[model samples]
Target: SRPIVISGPSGTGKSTLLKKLFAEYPDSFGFSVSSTTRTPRAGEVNGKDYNFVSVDEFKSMIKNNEFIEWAQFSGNYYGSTVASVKQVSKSGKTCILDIDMQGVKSVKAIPELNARFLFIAPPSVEDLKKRLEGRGTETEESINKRLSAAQAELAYAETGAHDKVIVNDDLDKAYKELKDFIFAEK
Candidate 1:
């Protein structure tokens, strides 16, 4: 099975889709938990949601080229380690990575890592903004930052980085499409 990387902007509900995917097929897939410098959120486990690390550790990782890709956002660091994803893939299960465009590009560039990229796009920027606002956790400044990044990501989605693009205008339809894609033969 090819490793699957699910990527898109902040408000596209990629997280929700994965939540459902895992719920339905827990034994069929493995998660490539990402690493982050940000403090864990409420109810978030350090080794589960992300591998929480120090700024020095993250910097050292960058220097050592330990991450497939990493980025700074909202003054914090976030990245996916090559080892974790490889571990999942080597275990004879589909590895699922929910990352950004940068990570997608990095994975694609690595010939040793065979994978598939899935882009989840919202119906429109307006729809994305509404979803973000509805989350009630983002400030105006952060939302603007994400929106700016989102535009670039959406543009990159059409640049042949993604193997499939799913518009997340309807939750059920999008989820069904995602499930089908994940379980389908590559």
Candidate 2:
């Protein structure tokens, strides 16, 4: 049983890469459907993409200690429960996670999981900032704030604890590198 993790600064294109990897290696792994307090985007399935929940529900789970690892990012919550991980394992495929730096630390802290942690990095800070601004998802002010957080994320991701750090300068090239790393274990 293998768990593949993708950790990076926000707007590093982790989600975009994960989508491609899943498409190319659909039968090779299970994509983690994180439990989130964020709403589902257009055309996103409730459980397949993410288990969308209300803030109250997420907070209740937090109070009850239901999550294996949880972190707040960009004013929303993201987490993976033991049950979800187990579900992935039961399916006989590696579970892939696209989460933040703290989540990476938490997973590395665990001996039983024995997961592969991959860090996704932008080629340049200027490129990262421009990419986030280009997304049109946030206002200029919000993009600035996220850029600050992204710096903190990259600081920890630069460490050796991550098994591999893939610079996503080009989307297709990054995906190929990521695929090679993940299937290297096989």
Candidate 3:
């Protein structure tokens, strides 16, 4: 089975959908834990949520060519390691890579991975704006930044880089579609 590399805009409810999928089939799928140089928030278990490491350690891994894909964000580094994905696969589960557009491209370029790319798209940019604003957690400036980045994300998705695109209009319908696509026979 191929690993799933999922990418979506900030407010597309992609996290919610993935949470549901994992809850429904806990043993069938596993997220490929990424290594990050950022500090973990409260209740985020090390190696479970993310492989929290120091900046030096992360840089060392990068130098050693241990990461399949790595990116710098907000002055911190984040990456997916070959061993992490292999660990999940060795456990007889479908490894899921929840990453950004850059990671998707990086993973897709590696023919050995044979990963399936999935994009969760909003019905419209206006609807996406409403969703982001409704969250009430972002400042106006941050919202603007997210909107601009989302425009780029949607543009890349439009280029047909993904194997499948699911417009997240209705949560239930979108989840069903996601589940079906992931479980669909190749």
> Model 3, range 14-99, lDDT digits (tens) per residue?
88999899999999999999999999999799988899999989989999999999999779999999899998999989999999
> Which candidate's lDDT is highest?
3
Extract clashing residue pairs from model 3: none
For model 1, residues 51-111, the per-residue Cα lDDT tens digits are: 9999999999999999888988769999989898888878877888888777788788887
TM-score of 1: 0.92
In Å, residue 140's CA in model 1 sits off its true spot by: 2.7
- lDDT computed for candidate 1: 0.86
Candidate 1 lDDT score at position 87: 85
User: Per-prediction RMSD in angstroms?
Assistant: 1.6, 1.8, 1.4
Candidate achieving higher TM-score, 1 or 2: 1
Off by over 4 Å in 3: none
- C-alpha lDDT score of every prediction, in listed order: 0.86, 0.84, 0.91
Q: Please give the clash total of every predicted structure, in order.
A: 0, 0, 0
Give the TM-score (vs. native) of candidate 2: 0.90
